[model samples]
Target: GEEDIPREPRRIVIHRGSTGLGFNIIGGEDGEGIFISFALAGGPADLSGELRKGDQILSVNGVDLRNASHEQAAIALKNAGQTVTIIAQYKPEEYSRFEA
Candidate 1:
């Protein structure tokens, strides 16, 4: 299966300190919850979105990214356009069924 997957393209763009870097949780409920970190000026994701540090990604393109592997989800993000909607769960709150 791994060999069937295509290699990711390398395209470096200027990040204007507006976006963040995305990471995935290894073992959690839903399994595909991604952690995003805010970017610094002139950083990799400098001009992206309101994605600040400590933001939890809930979905992408209306599709829940949970259950997807890190690389699989990363490919999706890499192919995303300038305008994207990301449902995120902020930190500094307790985990509750009603809230989460």
Candidate 2:
């Protein structure tokens, strides 16, 4: 699954551009946070060139996404409306950032 697996330490920002944005997102493990599931081809997300598979979502439109549930995160995206900004990063490691 395109879960929030640990990735390298990299951050990306996606500008909503001048149109509606499009993309798919999924949940992450405990302490892992949310991750971008997919980017709709030719869509704002895809066109941004900033989004990539496995990118962990850090925030949406300045809304923090850390450890947020899939539903809650989706709400942020929905609330973003037309234009939006998403701050996301990939898992920098193979293990969860949270301690059990």
Candidate 3:
């Protein structure tokens, strides 16, 4: 029943270059927040946008997630579906001036 379960549109923040960004993907149950990793071929989410690894999510679907908890944010993201606009800030470590 994969189709029965709502699929939210998610985006992955990938790092550019040879060196891979060290990180682990943990579910919301762990209370460690959402961890996204970047690989040579990239991950599930598309890195085509201006998103980066260290970028923090600020809002989703016009909802301010600045003070939202991980569980709350996860719920919102899961049901966001397609065509959701997510606003995020680039992390200093994942910032790159040069285009890949």
Candidate 4:
């Protein structure tokens, strides 16, 4: 089931500190886009306080993630500098499908 809510994309630049990105990612396989699987507490993403589970990762560092594999996106994320720029959109409804 797909919802037609008009969710706009938002941009945020997160600075990675001593801790890692502090988030796990999923999707981005077989032409699917990437989604933020989970965000750890007190971590880089947590500190930014903008990232959320189920947010579609539109791009990273201006690099398009719309059609990437999981490993491809993962490598791009790791290659990003300390300060990472991300464009994402909300999709809590879709997140529930993967939730257990």
Over 4 Å off, model 1: 1-32, 42-49, 92-100
Of 2 and 3, which scores higher on lDDT? 2
Clashes of each: 6, 4, 0, 0
What would the per-residue lDDT of candidate 3 be over residues 34-91, giving only the tens digit for each residue?
A: 3233422452234454444544566667776666666777676665654456665543
Q: Work out candidate 1's RMSD over C-alphas.
A: 13.4
TM-score of each: 0.48, 0.68, 0.48, 0.85
Model 2, which residues run further than 4 Å from truth?
1-20, 28-32, 92-100
lDDT of each: 0.46, 0.67, 0.45, 0.83
> Model 2 reaches what TM-score against the true structure?
0.68
Best by lDDT: 4
Q: List the residue pairs that clash in candidate 2.
A: 6-91, 7-91, 7-92, 56-89
Superposed by TM-score, candidate 2 places the C-alpha of residue 65 at a distance from the truth, in angstroms, of 0.6
Candidate 1, 1-100: lDDT as tens digits:
3343323311233322345433332223445355554345644444443444444555665556656655656666666565445565544222122233
Task: Give lDDT: candidate 1, residue 25.
Answer: 29
Superposed by TM-score, candidate 4 places the C-alpha of residue 37 at a distance from the truth, in angstroms, of: 0.6
Supply the TM-score for candidate 3.
0.48
User: Sorted on TM-score, highest at the top, how do the candidates line up?
Assistant: 4, 2, 3, 1
The worst-scoring run of ten residues by lDDT in candidate 2 lies at 91-100
Candidate 4 ranges with C-alpha deviation above 4 Å:
1-6
lDDT of 1: 0.46
Number of clashing residue pairs, candidate 3: 0
